[PDB]
Amino acid sequence: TDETEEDAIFSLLPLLRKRLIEAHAVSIEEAFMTGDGSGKPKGLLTLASED
Amino acid sequence: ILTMLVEPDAGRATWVAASAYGSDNTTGSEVTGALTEIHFSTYKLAAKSFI
């Protein structure tokens, strides 16, 4: 929000962008490791179980 | 006292079904987080002697 950037002593944007990018990386990594099949790529553990 | 800041943990994104691509669920979910802090302090040690 607009009234939080002024309402602080330091900036808060770089933290936001970093958290977004790393959240993407974490989610994709976890989904590839053990993601299900419904709407998400099948995880290696799930593939090995179903085979 | 001395005080610094501790950067928070990690979030994650979400997988959207390709069916809901037209709607407003396309963007997905939201990531949130807040900082913390730590403190330091000292203690006193002394000894005396007479001659």
Place this chain on the structure above:
Amino acid sequence: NQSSSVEVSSESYETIFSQRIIRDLQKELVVGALFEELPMSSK
């Protein structure tokens, strides 16, 4: 603020502590210093 996605730990990081020091009005002194002074050199 606790309204956006990202926050801050406490108000101490949303505050400015100023070293400027201010005082209220004070009573004026009149009587201590209008009478003539008589120096002494003994008891």
